[PDB]
Amino acid sequence: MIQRTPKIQVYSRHPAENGKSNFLNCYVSGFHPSDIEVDLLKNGERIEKVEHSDLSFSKDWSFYLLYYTEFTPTEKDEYACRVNHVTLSQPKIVKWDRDM
Amino acid sequence: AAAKKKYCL
Amino acid sequence: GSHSMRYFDTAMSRPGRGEPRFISVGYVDDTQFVRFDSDAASPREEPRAPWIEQEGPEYWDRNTQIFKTNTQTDRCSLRNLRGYYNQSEAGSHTLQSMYGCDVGPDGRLLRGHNQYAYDGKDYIALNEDLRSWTAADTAAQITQRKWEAARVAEQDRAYLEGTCVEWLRRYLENGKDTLERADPPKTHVTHHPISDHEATLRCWALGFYPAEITLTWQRDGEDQTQDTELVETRPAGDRTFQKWAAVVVPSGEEQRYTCHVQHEGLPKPLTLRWE
Numbered sequence: 001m002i003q004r005t006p007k008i009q010v011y012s013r014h015p016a017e018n019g020k021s022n023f024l025n026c027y028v029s030g031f032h033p034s035d036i037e038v039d040l041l042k043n044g045e046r047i048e049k050v051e052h053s054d055l056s057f058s059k060d061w062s063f064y065l066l067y068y069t070e071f072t073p074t075e076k077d078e079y080a081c082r083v084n085h086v087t088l089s090q091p092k093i094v095k096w097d098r099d100m
Numbered sequence: 101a102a103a104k105k106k107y108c109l
Numbered sequence: 110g111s112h113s114m115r116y117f118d119t120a121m122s123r124p125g126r127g128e129p130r131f132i133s134v135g136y137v138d139d140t141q142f143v144r145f146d147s148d149a150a151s152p153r154e155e156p157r158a159p160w161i162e163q164e165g166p167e168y169w170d171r172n173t174q175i176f177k178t179n180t181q182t183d184r185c186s187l188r189n190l191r192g193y194y195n196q197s198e199a200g201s202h203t204l205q206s207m208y209g210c211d212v213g214p215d216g217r218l219l220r221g222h223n224q225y226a227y228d229g230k231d232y233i234a235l236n237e238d239l240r241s242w243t244a245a246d247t248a249a250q251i252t253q254r255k256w257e258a259a260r261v262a263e264q265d266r267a268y269l270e271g272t273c274v275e276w277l278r279r280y281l282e283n284g285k286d287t288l289e290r291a292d293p294p295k296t297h298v299t300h301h302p303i304s305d306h307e308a309t310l311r312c313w314a315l316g317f318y319p320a321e322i323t324l325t326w327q328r329d330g331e332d333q334t335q336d337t338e339l340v341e342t343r344p345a346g347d348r349t350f351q352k353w354a355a356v357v358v359p360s361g362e363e364q365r366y367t368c369h370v371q372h373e374g375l376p377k378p379l380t381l382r383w384e
Contacts, residue, residue, distance in 0.1 A: 002229050013345045015315070027343045032229040033203050034121060053344075054144045054157075056117045056134045061205055061226045063119075068346050099301060099311070100340075100353075101168065102135060102143070102276040103116065103154075103175040104208055104268045107261050109186035109225065109233070109252045 004062055005087040006031035008094045010080065016073045016098040024071040024096065026081035029064035037084040038067045041093075043077060073098070110373060111219060112138055112288070114277040115209035120183035122191075122202050129187050131180040135209075137280050137288055139320045140348065145176035152177065160284035190227050193248035202228055208265075210273040216281075221269030239266040292318040292349055293374030298383045303357060310383055311355040312368030316345070323371040324354040333366075 006028040013023035026040055034055055040047045053066040071079065079096035118133040128147075134157075135143040142158035149155070154172040156162045187204050196202065208223040224234035233242050233249040233256075240262055244253040256262065281288050294314035302308040314322055320342050326333045333356050342352045358366055363383045370379040 004229065007341055009340065009343055011343070011351070013347060023346055025343070025346060027341075029341050029343075033201070034119060035201075054134050054141065054146065055119055055132055056136075056141075057119065057205060059207070061229055061231075066344050066346060099299065101172040101175050102114065102273070102280075103133070103145075103172045103179070104223075104273070105175055105264070106118075106179045106182045106186075106206070107256060107259070107264075108182050109189055109204070 002032065003087050004030055004032040006036060006083055006085055008081060008083050008092065009100075010094050010096045011100065012071075012073070012096075012098070013068070018074050019072060021070060021072050023068050024079055026067045026083075026094075027064065028067070028083060029058070030062040031064075031085055031087070032062050033086065034063045035086065036063075036065065037091075038065065039082045040067060040069050041078075041080040041082055042071070044080075047071075110291075111211060111213050112277060112281060113209060113211040114273060114280070115207055115222065118179070118183065118206045120180075120187055120204045122187050122200075124198055124201065129184050131176075131183045133176055133179065137277065137284065139318065139350070140284075140288060142280065143172070145173075147180045152180075158284065160280065160287070163283055189252075190232075190248070193251055194227075204232075205229075208269075210269050210277060212274060212277055216274070216278045218270060218274050221266070221273065223265050223269070235262060235265055239269060287348075290318075291372070291374035292316060294322060294370060294372050296368075296370055296379055296381055298368055298381050300363065300383050302360075305360065307357050307359055308363070309355045310358050310363060310366055310368070311353050312370070312381060313351070313353045314370055314372070315351050316349045317351075317372055317374060318349050319373070320344075320350045321373070322350070322352055323369070324352055325369045326354055326356040327367050327369060328356075328362075329365050330367075 007030045009027045040050050050069045057063045082091045082093045084091045116135045120129050120131045122129040131147040133145045142161045144155050154169050205226045210221050211219040225232045231245050233244050242253045244250045294317035299311045326337050338355045368381045
């Protein structure tokens with residue numbers, strides 16, 4: 001069976017401003033098959049109230065999902081997305097960088 | 101309905 | 110401009126973990142308006158769009174029943190496919206389908222779609238004629254034979270030329286303040302030194318709808334396709350989309366680069382530079 005590894009992007013809904021409420025997104029796309037594990041992290045800790053979009057896929061059949069949660073960026077706090085998939089040897093961690 | 105009745109492959 | 114309605118259905122087996130999950134999600138362009146998930150506590154056609162909430166309970170019930178029957182049909186299909194490929198009952202497999210119609214500005218049919226993939230590979234597709242099938246391999250030739258004997262393509266054609274186009278036109282009218290409104294991208298260029306010798310220019314497009322957009326960098330008017338990093342267009346979670354394109358520029362040569370943005374929301378194509 002062909003398998004495709006996820007592309008992962010971590011970003012905010014609106015451009016980030018310290019101390020102002022926002023949503024942290026982790027977009028996983030291009031993967032197959034559809035089972036995937038996504039966590040949003042705040043200083044390495046799993047955030048609990050995380051929502052996700054309904055599973056769908058693009059015209060080339062690869063799946064995508066958006067995982068999101070409300071957050072308030074600050075100079076101090078670090079955020080990230082950790083992803084696991086059958087195609088990955090170990091979980092992949094992509095840190096939130098406000099310039100990507 | 102907007103959904104379509106599907107057929108078994 | 111032009112519009113599409115499309116359903117994207119995923120059925121996935123999970124031996125030892127119950128029957129296969131079926132989820133079906135419908136979109137007009139890049140707006141989801143319905144979801145059905147067989148694993149939802151009470152499976153029902155569920156509105157994902159305020160303009161659909163406007164349809165009466167009979168619409169809901171009619172579609173709910175089509176989705177429930179489709180869940181059983183997709184499970185039938187997954188059992189038949191496992192056998193067509195001589196696969197064992199132990200493994201998980203995935204059947205996907207996409208169907209729906211595209212219409213132009215006048216609402217007339219541009220083309221219909223009904224196609225399937227198994228384990229991420231194309232399996233069978235209704236041709237653009239809406240009368241014949243293209244099968245990927247000898248297993249899909251069995252489905253093609255069954256569907257030719259049963260005159261399935263005619264039922265599909267009737268849906269695609271009738272029901273699908275009629276509902277898309279109705280959704281476009283009830284949803285016109287959102288479905289027919291293109292939001293242009295808010296654009297800007299950012300600069301990030303890498304070293305003394307180079308820096309990144311990143312050209313941003315934010316807050317746009319629909320998702321189709323083209324972002325390119327030119328050096329002295331020449332497209333830098335090969336040297337541009339383009340990220341997949343991504344959803345913001347408030348209906349709009351974001352994208353950027355970056356190129357690594359020799360220090361002092363920033364003004365030789367221009368970012369070009371085309372989007373249906375813009376009165377005219379944008380050309381942007383650093384500062």
